[PDB]
Design an enzyme around this catalytic site. Structure first.
Site, short mmCIF file in Angstrom:
data_model
loop_
_atom_site.label_atom_id
_atom_site.label_comp_id
_atom_site.label_asym_id
_atom_site.label_seq_id
_atom_site.Cartn_x
_atom_site.Cartn_y
_atom_site.Cartn_z
CG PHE A 165 -2.32 0.92 1.48
CD1 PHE A 165 -2.50 1.87 0.42
CD2 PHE A 165 -2.41 0.83 2.41
CE1 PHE A 165 -3.76 2.45 0.87
CE2 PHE A 165 -3.96 2.40 2.42
CZ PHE A 165 -3.79 2.89 1.57
CG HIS B 167 -8.01 3.74 -1.79
ND1 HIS B 167 -8.23 2.51 -1.79
CD2 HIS B 167 -6.71 3.62 -0.24
CE1 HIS B 167 -8.17 1.68 -1.09
NE2 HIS B 167 -7.89 1.71 0.01
N1 LIG Z 1 -13.88 -12.38 -1.55
C1 LIG Z 1 -13.98 -11.63 -1.28
N2 LIG Z 1 -15.54 -11.13 -2.33
C2 LIG Z 1 -16.38 -10.20 -2.51
N3 LIG Z 1 -16.24 -9.32 -1.68
C3 LIG Z 1 -14.78 -8.77 -0.84
C4 LIG Z 1 -14.02 -10.09 -0.95
N4 LIG Z 1 -13.09 -9.82 -0.13
C5 LIG Z 1 -13.02 -8.59 0.77
N5 LIG Z 1 -14.26 -8.17 0.16
C6 LIG Z 1 -14.74 -6.85 0.27
O1 LIG Z 1 -14.40 -5.80 -0.11
C7 LIG Z 1 -14.52 -4.35 0.51
C8 LIG Z 1 -13.39 -3.93 1.20
O2 LIG Z 1 -12.99 -3.83 -0.30
P1 LIG Z 1 -11.46 -3.33 0.51
O3 LIG Z 1 -10.85 -4.20 0.24
O4 LIG Z 1 -11.45 -2.54 -0.92
O5 LIG Z 1 -11.12 -2.65 1.48
C9 LIG Z 1 -15.18 -4.89 1.57
O6 LIG Z 1 -17.30 -4.66 1.90
P2 LIG Z 1 -18.23 -5.42 2.52
O7 LIG Z 1 -17.48 -4.50 3.73
O8 LIG Z 1 -19.61 -4.76 1.78
O9 LIG Z 1 -18.08 -6.15 3.09
C10 LIG Z 1 -14.79 -6.36 1.48
O10 LIG Z 1 -15.88 -6.96 3.07
C1 LIG Z 2 -5.26 -1.33 5.03
O1 LIG Z 2 -5.95 -0.56 4.37
C2 LIG Z 2 -6.78 0.63 4.04
C3 LIG Z 2 -6.31 1.04 5.40
C4 LIG Z 2 -6.48 1.96 6.43
C5 LIG Z 2 -5.87 2.76 7.45
O2 LIG Z 2 -5.89 3.98 8.28
C6 LIG Z 2 -6.57 3.28 5.35
C7 LIG Z 2 -7.47 2.49 3.69
C8 LIG Z 2 -6.78 1.39 3.60
O3 LIG Z 2 -7.39 1.05 2.23
#
Ligand SMILES: Nc1ncnc2c1ncn2[C@@H]1O[C@H](COP(=O)(O)O)[C@@H](OP(=O)(O)O)[C@H]1O
Ligand SMILES: COc1cc(C=O)ccc1O
Length: 336
Positions: free
Chosen positions: A99, A151
């Site tokens: 990240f 992001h």
């Molecule tokens: N294997 C999978 N299939 C579908 N969604 C997934 C997943 N693993 C993670 N996610 C979902 O992706 C979202 C997080 O995205 P990111 O990785 O961008 O933070 C979360 O949404 P929800 O909180 O709606 O469940 C998370 O649960």
């Molecule tokens: C592990 O991923 C993340 C962590 C954080 C913590 O502040 C913010 C955005 C993210 O996508």
């Protein structure tokens, strides 16, 4: 030379933000004409991030937060490493797919609290100080193809990314799902430290007063690049609906070929049922030093399209619908 303005948020609104978001203890900044919102350490690392040297064989995942990054990272990493599930299991995703800007959200005052709670484990403290340092160093050292999570919106990417024509997967998820997921993330992660409820947090989201907002600008810049040779734009919602199609499309974009049987294996591996028990993609390293509030719902949560939400209200749903219409009017953007 970092080319956009960086201005602390108007002081009265900055004070309220510091009261609700305890992971930041100096203030919040807005960047350029679009007012891209970040904690104080963005001012300090802006130049480093902008001049970060991309390579032609980098694979970049650019998303608004909680739009399906972790899912996509695991898919892409495996597609670009001969489906090597063994190595995917034994190296954390945050090591295999670093990240870029995580270090912006690790404030000095808040890192003192992590270090105090881990002050007997030298390794635990070396890990916490490493979180404070740009990933860009270890990444510049690498002599193998790199996988980079950000992001950062298109317009805030290191320009070497497009200069080098490196491959970018931009994933977009609908505002309703993103708002609820983002709120949970802000309560889960002590680097954010959000204390209030969903109604308050949605009001900050709607005013673009959450990290990496403006949401609608992030999505538009995404959509505006989707015709480029080195960009692949996808909706989380379509990825949930047709995994075999998502995996194959993604594999074709990255110039890789796999049998119906390998795709089948990838569908099982990436199903939420198996994924939420996967050691390498859950944030075990982060939860081990107490950066995660254990009480809250988990970084890999539900993974549903427009699933049941107790937090959501009729009045918030109507504002979300209106906010959607003011922003998407006279564009061809349609969430599936
Ligand atoms: N294997 C999978 N299939 C579908 N969604 C997934 C997943 N693993 C993670 N996610 C979902 O992706 C979202 C997080 O995205 P990111 O990785 O961008 O933070 C979360 O949404 P929800 O909180 O709606 O469940 C998370 O649960
Ligand atoms: C592990 O991923 C993340 C962590 C954080 C913590 O502040 C913010 C955005 C993210 O996508």
């Amino acid at each position: 030379p970092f080319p956009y303005s960086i201005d602390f948020v108007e002081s009265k609104q900055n004070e309220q933000l510091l009261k609700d978001f305890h992971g930041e203890r100096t203030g919040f900044v807005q960047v350029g004409e679009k007012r891209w919102f970040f904690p104080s350490r963005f001012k300090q690392y802006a130049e480093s991030l902008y001049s970060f040297e991309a390579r032609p064989d980098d694979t970049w995942i650019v998303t608004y937060p909680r739009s399906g990054t972790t899912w996509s990272q695991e898919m892409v990493w495996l597609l670009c490493n001969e489906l090597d599930f063994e190595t995917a299991k034994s190296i954390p995703l945050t090591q295999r797919f670093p990240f870029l800007e995580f270090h912006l959200f690790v404030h000095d005052e808040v890192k003192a609290e992590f270090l105090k709670e881990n002050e007997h484990d030298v390794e635990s403290m070396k890990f916490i100080e490493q979180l404070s340092q740009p990933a860009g160093f270890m990444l510049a050292e690498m002599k193998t193809p790199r996988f980079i999570k950000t992001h950062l919106p298109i317009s805030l990417l290191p320009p070497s990314v497009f200069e080098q024509k490196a491959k970018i997967i931009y994933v977009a998820r609908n505002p309703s799902d993103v708002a609820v997921s983002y709120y949970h993330l802000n309560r889960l992660y002590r680097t954010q430290g959000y204390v209030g409820d969903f109604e308050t947090f949605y009001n900050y989201f709607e005013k673009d007063l959450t990290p990496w907002s403006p949401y609608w600008e992030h999505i538009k810049e995404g959509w505006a690049e989707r015709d480029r040779e080195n960009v692949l734009f996808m909706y989380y919602e379509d990825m949930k609906r047709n995994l075999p199609d998502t995996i194959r499309k993604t594999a074709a974009f990255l110039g890789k070929s796999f049998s119906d049987d390998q795709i089948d294996t990838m569908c099982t591996h990436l199903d939420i049922r198996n994924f939420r028990h996967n050691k390498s993609v859950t944030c075990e390293e982060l939860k081990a030093v107490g950066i995660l509030n254990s009480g809250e719902q988990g970084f890999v949560r539900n993974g549903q399209v427009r699933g049941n939400a107790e937090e959501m209200t009729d009045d918030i749903k109507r504002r979300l619908n209106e906010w959607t219409e003011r922003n998407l009017n006279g564009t061809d953007i349609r969430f599936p």
